[PDB]
Each structure stands twice: as structure tokens, then as C-alpha cells.
Scaffold this active site. Structure first.
Site, PDB file in Angstrom:
ATOM      1  N   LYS A   1       4.103  -0.086  -4.653  1.00 16.21           N
ATOM      2  CA  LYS A   1       4.690  -1.321  -4.148  1.00 16.21           C
ATOM      3  C   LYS A   1       4.364  -2.529  -5.010  1.00 16.21           C
ATOM      4  O   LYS A   1       5.078  -3.534  -4.943  1.00 16.21           O
ATOM      5  CB  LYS A   1       4.218  -1.583  -2.726  1.00 16.21           C
ATOM      6  CG  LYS A   1       4.688  -0.545  -1.756  1.00 16.21           C
ATOM      7  CD  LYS A   1       4.444  -0.997  -0.344  1.00 16.21           C
ATOM      8  CE  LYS A   1       5.104  -0.046   0.624  1.00 16.21           C
ATOM      9  NZ  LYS A   1       4.393   1.265   0.663  1.00 16.21           N
TER      10      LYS A   1
ATOM     11  N   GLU B   1       7.764  -8.757   5.461  1.00 16.90           N
ATOM     12  CA  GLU B   1       7.444  -7.907   6.593  1.00 16.90           C
ATOM     13  C   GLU B   1       6.616  -6.724   6.110  1.00 16.90           C
ATOM     14  O   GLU B   1       6.587  -6.404   4.920  1.00 16.90           O
ATOM     15  CB  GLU B   1       8.723  -7.422   7.286  1.00 16.90           C
ATOM     16  CG  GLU B   1       9.246  -6.067   6.799  1.00 16.90           C
ATOM     17  CD  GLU B   1       9.738  -6.091   5.357  1.00 16.90           C
ATOM     18  OE1 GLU B   1       9.938  -7.193   4.801  1.00 16.90           O
ATOM     19  OE2 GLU B   1       9.933  -5.001   4.778  1.00 16.90           O
TER      20      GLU B   1
ATOM     21  N   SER C   1       2.758   8.364  -5.082  1.00 19.67           N
ATOM     22  CA  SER C   1       3.092   6.964  -4.863  1.00 19.67           C
ATOM     23  C   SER C   1       1.910   6.124  -4.391  1.00 19.67           C
ATOM     24  O   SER C   1       2.057   4.903  -4.285  1.00 19.67           O
ATOM     25  CB  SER C   1       4.234   6.865  -3.852  1.00 19.67           C
ATOM     26  OG  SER C   1       3.907   7.548  -2.656  1.00 19.67           O
TER      27      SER C   1
END
Ligand SMILES: *Cc1c(COP(=O)(O)O)cnc(C)c1O
Ligand SMILES: [Cl-]
Ligand SMILES: [Cl-]
Ligand SMILES: [Cs+]
Lengths: 394, 254
Positions: free
Chosen positions: A86, A108, A376
Site C-alpha cells: 500500500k 478510509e 503483499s
């Protein structure tokens, strides 16, 4: 009217209130401009390399594939600053925010990891960052709340509706509708309205671009398949993107199976949902027979998104990519197996990708195949949940 | 039968403005909401804007967010919302009934099928809160195929291309949020449907000011549901304060 196609086949669009359309047309044009600006690309690469740690490693699994003819590589996005993929796109989005003269960031989050990603990006680039989160997510992710607030972020709990991610997704858009001239909405995944699916893909496609160059350097050939977990689809489309025109490369995305698909408690809308319209996009969704959107269940907190990115739905409908599901117990076994045999504690998210790779390897052990699994994220955030389950079973 | 053209023609013949209250169907209950709507119409409501409880109303504030929760708590589903709509039409044949929808409840059982059932129950118009005019093509086509007016929101940040689209594709009335005087002129210039100002319309002074500004009337959203939210324990005192407020706001348009 937009510069880029808001649709991937029949999926996508900009299903937002009319007040938000200028905010989207502004975001699209700044993105198209940034893509043609070498100075923007140089600063993006500078933060990725010198702050986040790119390029990430491609680790060949020594011990996990013994007894089979499978060569398994792990794309180590778990070694990125923050501990997950991310970080890549939030650095790009925050740079886009500066390009548009924005000084605030709205974000969010559900599991808290996108909030941690947004907070670290806003802190680095000098942006005031307020984050919306479900009140039930606030209680189970108190470690990640402290992380965000340590990094100077305002965590606003959302008791609306289900008090989960989809209500955080709502409350953030409500704020952005009156504050888009100063604030920028930093969406979490490759979903939502155009141009967010396109933007998050382009700010994550270095995953697959690095994986391609690294696998050509190491094995002298492209992989037989790349496998990635799918919550909203950012880490999967980041891996898939540079391989889409490589038609000999399999694209496997893994959705959370929860307690089993036939139990209803899962999070696989792409293969076991129904196409609806919510969060500004037409896409497969978890929803009731009357059209109310449900929540995704998974042992993985990061795979709680009740829908899926539109480019994934498009890639599935044309047969370019294949999408399977992995239960909670399958991902847990993959979690324990990677720890003992490689010394890498993976995220429960990425364990779904690895679990399917172990399935491909185990069910056909004499099949010669070169597989790359996108790791990830790291799993240090999950050792407590893994502990309580293995303490309860026996 | 285009009840909007006939209501706007009437209200013009008496130099009046329209007052359109908003409530969520089945809030706080099926039977209570039916008597609430009956109270609004007798009080002097000219039209009705009604909301179907959606699990994720990303375009509504907290006061209506609770109205959906109050309705879901009572168990109201889109199925009994339309049997409510049918009963309301059979009680008041002339009043225009408008729906505030979200795109999923329209898309769920097929877009054209959703507008087909609105026509079956007598719904005059539908605004889909999360479909912009740029994505409106399939929705307004299905709405016109069943004699439904597609209602479009014209926001305060509207450029000239948006005003031209809302004027062309909009029917029944134009939802103004909002100097609105410059936006009212351009909509009359482009022959847009009569504009109803709906944004924090709380006092009778805002209904009056909207008409003087050139709008055809005012839409009160949170103001009515706030009154329902306040008197949840007192059923009649709710309707009592409902009748006083709506007849006060209706007089403000004369
Ligand atoms: C956020 C999360 C995911 C799910 O994100 P996508 O949008 O599907 O890419 C996957 N892995 C980790 C570690 C996560 O935190
Ligand atoms: Cl490195
Ligand atoms: Cl490289
Ligand atoms: Cs999902």
C-alpha cells in the site's frame, strides 16, 4: 466527458453524486498530466527508492517446493516501508495531491493498514491527514490506530451503518464533497470510481515491472503464472499489469473464502457475488437478494472489501485472468508453512495467494512450473490472531 | 399523467410556490410512516420526495442515515416500500410522488424492471442520488420508457456544460442545492424543468426566499425527519408538530 475510458468492458464508471464529478475530472486530468511529466516521475521514483525501499526482492523458495517440479518465487512487497504494498500508491497519490495544490488528505481504512499507509505518506509530504474508520474496526485494530495517530493523523471512528470499511468509504466521500478544493481523497484499493482504478494500478505496476525484469534475470524466462490475493485488487493489478500483454503468463487472483463459499461467510464477490453499483463503480459485489450490500468475511482483515476492482471483473469476463478462492484454514496452513520452511512470516492476506500456489504445486507435484506469488505484506500484525486460533483449536 | 406539469400550472395560476417535504419510507415503521405521509399531504404538501431505505446512503447526512437505520430496524424492504407507494397513490391521485433512490436498488432487478414497477404503483419521478448526468443514459431511457421523470441534481459547482445537460435530460423538476439567482436564470434560459431548491430548507423564511429567487419551490429534507426523530416516543405529538411545520412552510410559499 473524460480523457480516459472510465470503463473496463462493462465494469467501472463514475457512479458518484453530481457534486463529486468536478473532483473526479480534476483528479483525472492531474493524473494524466503527471503521467506525462518527467519531473513527477523522478520524484515518485525518488520516494519509492530512497524512502520506501524499492526495488523489492524476488526470493526463490529453497525449501517449500522440495519433492515437486515447481519453482516458486516470492515478490517481497513485505519488505516495503510500512510492511505492505500500500505504500507505493499512497506516495503517488500524495504527490498528486501536491500537484493539485491540495494540503489535506482524506482516507478510509478497515484493517488500519491503509490508514497507516496514508498517515506515513502525509507525514512525509507535509499534509494534514484525517482518516475515517469503522468503530468496530477501531476496537479490533487499536495497534494500527496508535500507529496512525503517532504519525500525526486524525482517526475519526464511523459508527454509521455497519461501522466497517464500507461506512468509512461513505463518510470519507461525504467529507470530500465539500472539501475537494483543499483536500484529496486517497482511496485504498484499485476500486471506486474512475479514475481511481486506473490511478492505483499505474502507481502499483512497478510490482510486476520489477518482477518481470527480475525473473528474466534469474530464470531467463517469464513465469507460468503470477498469483496474488484480491481484496479490492491493488496488489493483484500491480503485479498483473505488465504481464497482461504477455499472453503466455497466467494471471491468478485469489479471493478470501472465509469459512467456505457454500457457507455464505466469505469475501469472493468476483466469482460468488452479483454485479451491482456501489462505491462509484459497477462491479461484482457482496449483496443481499434485495440489493443491500453485505460485508466480506475473512480471517484476513485486509480482504474485507465487499466488492472488487472493475479491471479484475473485466479481466475475468474475457478469460485473461483466472480467479480462485482460498478458505481460512488453507491460508492459515500456508501461513505456518512459510514460517517454518523459509523464515518469512507473511500477511494473512498474502497467505491466500501462497495457499493457492501450494495447492497448484501439491495437487500436481510432477508438473514443471515457474510460479511467482506476490507477498503483499508481512504477517507480524497477524501473529496475535494466529495465536488465539491455534490456542483455541485444542 | 404528468402531475408535475399540472401542479406547476396550478401553483402558477395562484402565484404560489411548491413545498415538497422528504421522508424515508417505513421510518420509524410501516404503519407510522403511512400516517406520517398522510399528515404531510393534509398539512399542505404540494409534492412528495420519498426515500427507499438503502444500506449505504453515501449521499445523505446523518439525520437521514438514521432514518434508514430506523426503517431497517422495522424491517422495511424495497418490496414493501412499493406496496406503500401503491397505497399512497390510491389515497392521493393528484399529488406528485418522487423517489430518492440509490443506483444499486434500481440496477438490482434490472433497470427497466425497476421503473416498470414505479409506473405500476404510480410514481411520477425518480432521482438516483449516485448516478451523475454523465452516466445517466440507461437510467433516463428506462425512466422515459415508463413515463417516469428522471430528476437530476444541479449542484452549486455546476459549469455551463452541466446546466445544459440537466436542462436537456431533466424532466418533472430540477433539484437545486445551491447566488442561486444566476443559476436559476441559466436553467430558465436553457428551458430546464422547474427548479426546486432543496438544501437545509428549515424555516419558512427559506421557502419564501427560494420562490423570490426564482425557483419554483423548496424541498425540505432533514427538517421533517428531524421532527420525526425528535418525537419517536410520542406518535401523535410527532404528527401534531408535523402538521404545524408543513402548514407553516406551505404558507411561506403563497
Ligand atoms: C490491503 C491488503 C491487501 C488487500 O489489498 P488489495 O486492494 O486487494 O491489493 C493485500 N495484502 C495486504 C498486506 C493488505 O494489507
Ligand atoms: Cl532494496
Ligand atoms: Cl529491477
Ligand atoms: Cs473481496
Amino acid at each position: 466527458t473524460t480523457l480516459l475510458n472510465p470503463y473496463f468492458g462493462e465494469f467501472g464508471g463514475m457512479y458518484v453524486p453530481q457534486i463529486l464529478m468536478p473532483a473526479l475530472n480534476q483528479l483525472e486530468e492531474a493524473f494524466v498530466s503527471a503521467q506525462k511529466d518527467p519531473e513527477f516521475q523522478a520524484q515518485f521514483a525518488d520516494l519509492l527508492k530512497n524512502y520506501a525501499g524499492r526495488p523489492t526482492a524476488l526470493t526463490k523458495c529453497q525449501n517449500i517446493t522440495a519433492g515437486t517440479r515447481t519453482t516458486l518465487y516470492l515478490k517481497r512487497e513485505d519488505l516495503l516501508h510500512g510492511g505492505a504494498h500500500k505504500t507505493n500508491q499512497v506516495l503517488g497519490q500524495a504527490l498528486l495531491a501536491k500537484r493539485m495544490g491540495k494540503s489535506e488528505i482524506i482516507a478510509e481504512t478497515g484493517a488500519g493498514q491503509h490508514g497507516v499507509a496514508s498517515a506515513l505518506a502525509s507525514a512525509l509530504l507535509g499534509l494534514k491527514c484525517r482518516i475515517y474508520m469503522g468503530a468496530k474496526d477501531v476496537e479490533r485494530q487499536s495497534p494500527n490506530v496508535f500507529r496512525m495517530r503517532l504519525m500525526g493523523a486524525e482517526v475519526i471512528p464511523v459508527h454509521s451503518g455497519s461501522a466497517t470499511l464500507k461506512d468509512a468509504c461513505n463518510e470519507a466521500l461525504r467529507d470530500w464533497s465539500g472539501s475537494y478544493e483543499t483536500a484529496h481523497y486517497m482511496l485504498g484499493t484499485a476500486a471506486g470510481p474512475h479514475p481511481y482504478p486506473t490511478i492505483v494500478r499505474e502507481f502499483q505496476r512497478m510490482i510486476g515491472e520489477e518482477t518481470k525484469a527480475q525473473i528474466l534475470d534469474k530464470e531467463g524466462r517469464l513465469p507460468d503464472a503470477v498469483i496474488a490475493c484480491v481484496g479490492g485488487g491493488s496488489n493483484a493489478i500491480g503485479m498483473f499489469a505488465d504481464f497482461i500483454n504477455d499472453t503466455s503468463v497466467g494471471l491468478i487472483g485469489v479471493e478470501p473464502g472465509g469459512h467456505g463459499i457454500e457457507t455464505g461467510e466469505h469475501g469472493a464477490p468476483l466469482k460468488h457475488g452479483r454485479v451491482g453499483i456501489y462505491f462509484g463503480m459497477k462491479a461484482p459485489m457482496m449483496q443481499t437478494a434485495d440489493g443491500q450490500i453485505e460485508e466480506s468475511y475473512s480471517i484476513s482483515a485486509g480482504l474485507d472489501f465487499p466488492s472488487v476492482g472493475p479491471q479484475h471483473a473485466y479481466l475475468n469476463s474475457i478469460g485473461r485472468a483466472d480467479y480462485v478462492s482460498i478458505t481460512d484454514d488453507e491460508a492459515l496452513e500456508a501461513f505456518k508453512t512459510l514460517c517454518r520452511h523459509e523464515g518469512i512470516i507473511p500477511a494473512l492476506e498474502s497467505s491466500h495467494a501462497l495457499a493457492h500456489a501450494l495447492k497448484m504445486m501439491r495437487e500436481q507435484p510432477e508438473k514443471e512450473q515457474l510460479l511467482v506469488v506476490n507477498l503483499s505484506g508481512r504477517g507480524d500484525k497477524d501473529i496475535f490472531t494466529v495465536h488465539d486460533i491455534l490456542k483455541a483449536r485444542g | 399523467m404528468e402531475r408535475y406539469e399540472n401542479l406547476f400550472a396550478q401553483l402558477n395560476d395562484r402565484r404560489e410556490g411548491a413545498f415538497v417535504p422528504f421522508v424515508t419510507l417505513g421510518d420509524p415503521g410501516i404503519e407510522q410512516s403511512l400516517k406520517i405521509i398522510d399528515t404531510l399531504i393534509d398539512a399542505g404538501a404540494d409534492a412528495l420526495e420519498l426515500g427507499v431505505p438503502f444500506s449505504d446512503p453515501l449521499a445523505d447526512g446523518p439525520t437521514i442515515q438514521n432514518a434508514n437505520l430506523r426503517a431497517f430496524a422495522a424491517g422495511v424492504t424495497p418490496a414493501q416500500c412499493f406496496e406503500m407507494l401503491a397505497l399512497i397513490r390510491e389515497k392521493h391521485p393528484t399529488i406528485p410522488i418522487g423517489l430518492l433512490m440509490y443506483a444499486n436498488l434500481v440496477f438490482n432487478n434490472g433497470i427497466d424492471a425497476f421503473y416498470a414497477r414505479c409506473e405500476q404503483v404510480g410514481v411520477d419521478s425518480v432521482l438516483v442520488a449516485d448516478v451523475p448526468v454523465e452516466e445517466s443514459a440507461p437510467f433516463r431511457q428506462a425512466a422515459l420508457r415508463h413515463n417516469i421523470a428522471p430528476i437530476f441534481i444541479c449542484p452549486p459547482n455546476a459549469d455551463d456544460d452541466l446546466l445544459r445537460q440537466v436542462a436537456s435530460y431533466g424532466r418533472g423538476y430540477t433539484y437545486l442545492l445551491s447566488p442561486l439567482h444566476h443559476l436559476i436564470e441559466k436553467l430558465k434560459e436553457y428551458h430546464a424543468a422547474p427548479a426546486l431548491q432543496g438544501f437545509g430548507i428549515s424555516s419558512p423564511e427559506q421557502v419564501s426566499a427560494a420562490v423570490r429567487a426564482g425557483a419554483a419551490g423548496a424541498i425540505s429534507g432533514s427538517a421533517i425527519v428531524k421532527i420525526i426523530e425528535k418525537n419517536l416516543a410520542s406518535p401523535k405529538q410527532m404528527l401534531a408538530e408535523l402538521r404545524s411545520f408543513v402548514s407553516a412552510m406551505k404558507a411561506a410559499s403563497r
